[PDB]
Scaffold this active site. Structure first.
Site, short mmCIF file in Angstrom:
data_model
loop_
_atom_site.label_atom_id
_atom_site.label_comp_id
_atom_site.label_asym_id
_atom_site.label_seq_id
_atom_site.Cartn_x
_atom_site.Cartn_y
_atom_site.Cartn_z
N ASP A 10 0.93 -1.11 0.00
CA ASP A 10 0.00 0.00 0.00
C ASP A 10 0.98 1.17 0.00
O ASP A 10 2.16 0.97 0.29
CB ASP A 10 -0.85 0.00 1.27
CG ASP A 10 -1.83 1.15 1.31
OD1 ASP A 10 -2.52 1.39 0.28
OD2 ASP A 10 -1.92 1.83 2.36
N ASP A 21 0.82 5.07 1.41
CA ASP A 21 1.03 5.82 2.65
C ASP A 21 1.12 4.96 3.90
O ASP A 21 0.24 4.15 4.18
CB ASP A 21 -0.06 6.86 2.85
CG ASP A 21 0.00 7.96 1.83
OD1 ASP A 21 1.09 8.23 1.29
OD2 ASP A 21 -1.06 8.58 1.59
#
Lengths: 256, 257
Positions: free
Chosen positions: B9, B11
């Site tokens: 992913d 952030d």
């Protein structure tokens, strides 16, 4: 007469974390509804600030310090390094075991893969080692090159390529730039196409490299913590990028 | 026997709290690729919203738009556009209530209404300028996801009248519009189905609640050191925080490196 504002990236549009300030987005917004043309002028290669362009919706810019100028999505002007010279540099660098990275308007390629100097320096930029392609320059417009060698080794290169300029940015890497060209010449070219006059042009910059620009436009703006010599040639010194400098500056200049 | 793949992913996983890319993560990805392990990003974002990161890490495989647009080594592997028919209805009905939408595809983004204050605010938070205006962009282009601008108090009808879409709120005045049945874990499922990769060879690193489904679905889910506890619960292994070489350490522990 229409007005236009040119922004550089580092320390200007992006703060020191490489992030885009909320107030800057606002500034550009107000600037656009006021009918003021917005563009970028930078030393960076186009593919190196595509994200900023996409974020602010800017499709007119002076990149590679004026060697590649794009007007509303189209190439207005382009002056790549001479093929002959790039070759000679490649071969000479090869002979010395020094790698090179070729940069065109879309990407970059290394003449040697998995090389220690490229890893370290490129990683300092937060970039992975570029894909390898020793002959990338053969059928491509190479606007810039990165020579990976120590300062104590550049002498010969500097000496044999007077038509080139070398600006070190890391212990083991230096930018290989064309002697001619400039952001001001890039800006000059765009305002001509736009029908704008020097007096109606503004520019925000932060580094030594922005002096020529800030000097040529009618109103050059230096950022708060810009180098003293950058502020000296500026018509106005605004707050740091960190403190709404772009917004504050544009307000004081009564552009928004 | 087979290939392994690791999904990340963005952030909190690839980028730390300051949106910074750790040096060791660059090494991590380099080492994985060298070993023949596939590296891909899995996100709800539009391709154009994380191209810089991709170029930085040389990642050209990913699951974007919560599973509706999946690319492998530069080529589209799977794509599920929103049903144009339903997109048109949602736009008209929403327009009746003064709620605008933003249409998103792999290259760009378009707003149904110009100079709208909810678009400005919710989008500036994503660090984006107001999208160019084009009320009929979806009519001639494939849209993979859209944005509806209205408050939580006004969504009920839309949610109710359009069961073919899934409205997931992320801001006070804007919610995502995905096709019912779509999710990034789902996108990860066909990426690996098409690639012929066994689940036992699929790894994923996540940090937020939106990473829970992904993490529990893959063979080995990895939660970051400062991840929400509901994320760590489903993780098969919890690594160090993102700014503590979390990814490098984790990959080392899992012996992928």
């Amino acid at each position: 007469g229409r007005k236009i504002v040119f922004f550089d990236i580092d320390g200007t549009l992006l703060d020191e974390q490489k992030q885009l300030p909320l107030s800057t987005i606002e500034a550009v917004r107000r600037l656009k509804q006021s009918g003021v043309y917005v563009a970028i002028a930078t030393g960076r290669a186009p593919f190196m600030f595509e994200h900023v362009r996409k974020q602010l919706g800017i499709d007119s810019f002076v990149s590679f310090n004026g060697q590649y100028v794009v007007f509303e999505g189209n190439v207005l002007y382009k002056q790549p390094l001479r093929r002959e010279k790039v070759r000679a540099l490649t071969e000479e660098a090869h002979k010395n075991g020094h790698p090179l990275v070729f940069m065109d308007a879309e990407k970059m390629r290394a003449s040697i893969g998995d090389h220690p100097h490229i890893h370290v320096s490129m990683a300092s930029l937060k970039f992975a080692h570029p894909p390898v392609d020793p002959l990338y320059y053969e059928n491509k417009d190479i606007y810039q090159a990165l020579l990976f060698c120590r300062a104590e080794e550049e002498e010969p290169y500097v000496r044999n390529y007077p038509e080139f300029r070398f600006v070190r940015w890391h212990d083991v890497s230096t930018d290989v730039l064309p002697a001619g060209g400039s952001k001001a010449e890039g800006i000059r070219m765009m305002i001509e196409k736009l029908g704008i006059d020097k007096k109606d042009v503004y520019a925000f910059g932060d580094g030594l490299n922005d002096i020529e620009m800030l000097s040529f436009v009618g109103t050059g703006v230096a950022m708060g913590n810009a180098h003293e010599e950058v502020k000296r040639v500026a018509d106005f010194v605004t707050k740091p990028v960190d403190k709404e400098g772009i917004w504050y500056g544009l307000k004081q200049l009564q552009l928004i």
